[PDB]
Amino acid sequence: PRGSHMDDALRGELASTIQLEKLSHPPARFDLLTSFVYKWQTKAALARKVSGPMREWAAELKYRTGVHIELEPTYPERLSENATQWGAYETADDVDITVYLFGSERGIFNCHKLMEAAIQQDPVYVRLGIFRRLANSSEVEWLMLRRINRELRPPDIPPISLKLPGKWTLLYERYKEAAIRTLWEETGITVDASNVYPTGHLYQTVPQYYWRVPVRYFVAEVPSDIRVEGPQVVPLQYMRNWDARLLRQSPDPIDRAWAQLADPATGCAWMKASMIDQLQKPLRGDNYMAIRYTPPPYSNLQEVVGLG
Ligand SMILES: Nc1nc2c(ncn2[C@@H]2O[C@H](COP(=O)(O)OP(=O)(O)O)[C@@H](O)[C@H]2O)c(=O)[nH]1
Numbered sequence: 001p002r003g004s005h006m007d008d009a010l011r012g013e014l015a016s017t018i019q020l021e022k023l024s025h026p027p028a029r030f031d032l033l034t035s036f037v038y039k040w041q042t043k044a045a046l047a048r049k050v051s052g053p054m055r056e057w058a059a060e061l062k063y064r065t066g067v068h069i070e071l072e073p074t075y076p077e078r079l080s081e082n083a084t085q086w087g088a089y090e091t092a093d094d095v096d097i098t099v100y101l102f103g104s105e106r107g108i109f110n111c112h113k114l115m116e117a118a119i120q121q122d123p124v125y126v127r128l129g130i131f132r133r134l135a136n137s138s139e140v141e142w143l144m145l146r147r148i149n150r151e152l153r154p155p156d157i158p159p160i161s162l163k164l165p166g167k168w169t170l171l172y173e174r175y176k177e178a179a180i181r182t183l184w185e186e187t188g189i190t191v192d193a194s195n196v197y198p199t200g201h202l203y204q205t206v207p208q209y210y211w212r213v214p215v216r217y218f219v220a221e222v223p224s225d226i227r228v229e230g231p232q233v234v235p236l237q238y239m240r241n242w243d244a245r246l247l248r249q250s251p252d253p254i255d256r257a258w259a260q261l262a263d264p265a266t267g268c269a270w271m272k273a274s275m276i277d278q279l280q281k282p283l284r285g286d287n288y289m290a291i292r293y294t295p296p297p298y299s300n301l302q303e304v305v306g307l308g
Contacts (some may be wrong), residue, residue, distance in 0.1 A: 001032065003070055006152045007059035012234050013167075013185070014063045018042075018116045020108075026100065033068055033102045038112075040101070044210035045093035046119045047071055053154050053211050056168050057123055064171075065111040067103035074098045079208050089207040097210065118171055122214070127166035128179035128196060129219040129293040130189060131305060132226070132270070139306050141270035142289070143228060145186055146239040146258060156209050160239065162254050162279065164293075165189075168213070175216045186238075187268065188229035189222060196220045197299040199292060217292045219305065230266030240267040254279055273306060 020038040030037070040047075051058045051071050058069040073079060074096035081088040089095050101108050131140040147161045167182035169175060176196050184190055196218050203214040231238045241264050248259040257279060262269040271279075273289040280288035294308065295301040302308040 002152050003055065003058070004033075004068070006055045006150070007062050007068075009150055009152070010054070010056060010059040011063065014060060015233075018112060018119065020101070020112055026102070030070060030100060030102075033070065033100075035102055036105050036108060038101045038108055040099040040115075041074070042097055042099060043093060044095035044097050047097035047099050048211055048213060049119045049121070049123050050099065050115050051211060052123070052168070053157060053213060054150075057118060057171060060171050061111050061114060061118070064114060065103065065107040067101050067107045067111040069111075070100040070102065072098050072100075073210070092205045092207045092210040092212065095207050095210040114171065121172065123169050123171075124175065124201070124214040124216045125166070125168050126175055126179040126182060126216050126218065127164050127292070128183045128191070129164050129199065129217065129289075130183065130187065130191070130222050131219060131293075132222050132224045133304060134224065137272075139272045139274065140304065141272055142276060142293075143187060143189075143222075144262075144269045144271050144276070145231070145267060146254075146262075147186075148237055148239060150237075154209070154211060156212065160254075162258075166218075169216075176218060179216070179218045183220075185233040186231050188232045189226060191220045191222070197295050197301065199294055199296065202292065215292075219293050219295050219299075219301070221301070221304070228266055228268050230268050235267070238267040240264060253282075 018040055020040055023037045023039055026034050026037045050069060061069055078086060078089055130143045133140050142164055145163055147163060149157050149159060149161060165183045165186045166179050169178040176193060180191055180193060180196060199217045199219050201214050201216045205212040244259045247255050250256060261271060277288040290307040295305055
């Protein structure tokens with residue numbers, strides 16, 4: 001019942017081999033979905049590529065074929081263990097996951113080959129660090145957004161995410177291609193692929209959070225004078241039309257900094273790296289921007305951005 005609701009929410013933002021096993025009927029726990037049902041016994045290293053933290057790719061597979069993807073840890077009691085067929089999993093990739101498919105065999109056949117191609121790639125989150133240089137200052141300003149995540153979310157996703165632009169790679173989409181397209185979807189800024197530079201990737205997960213995906217990072221300079229329109233895809237899902245008087249007095253530092261630098265008409269804000277890491281210091285430690293958005297030397301840009 002929760003899996004469907006999350007797939008319905010992503011509909012607005014949508015525009016070596018797999019051994020399936022047909023099941024006579026589904027287990028009683030999955031009858032409400034029941035329409036055939038096929039099972040795929042795999043690991044989280046593979047099942048993560050057809051689901052996603054917010055069911056990004058499980059919803060696209062439904063948008064494509066009409067099949068419903070349902071995932072469950074095969075032996076979830078092992079995820080409650082600290083220290084073999086039983087005990088704590090070594091890594092998240094090793095977590096046994098059982099995937100269920102619901103729909104017509106026509107739609108299941110289409111999704112099956114889509115899934116066999118999905119598990120071949122590396123689907124990740126992308127963040128294109130958009131920055132501009134200030135004539136009066138020496139440091140750069142980065143464009144920040146605050147997305148209001150939905151109620152149906154995994155426990156590792158906050159209610160509001162202070163983020164730089166960027167979403168996720170669609171099925172068969174590539175890193176830079178996703179970073180540029182998702183940049184416009186969240187900001188409305190058009191950046192050329194020759195000015196986008198990869199700055200690194202991060203993957204930190206635990207077995208209990210088997211769904212977590214790597215994050216590929218990019219940076220690109222924007223002209224200091226530019227019309228930042230804000231989110232054009234699902235704009236209601238971002239912090240907008242807020243009230244600067246009362247939020248300025250919120251006990252959250254993010255919130256106060258948002259009331260002072262954010263524009264409620266666009267939901268966007270320009271922040272310096274020293275300000276972003278100060279905001280991320282109590283949650284992430286030091287060097288939040290430097291760890292993620294340090295340009296490669298061939299960009300001839302780590303001099304300009306200031307992290308280096
Ligand atoms: N949000 C999110 N973060 C992840 C996921 N998987 C890994 N991470 C970690 O997120 C850290 C950096 O996150 P950040 O750049 O602040 O993006 P954000 O956490 O999604 O706002 C990295 O150390 C990654 O290991 C995921 O599926 N979702």
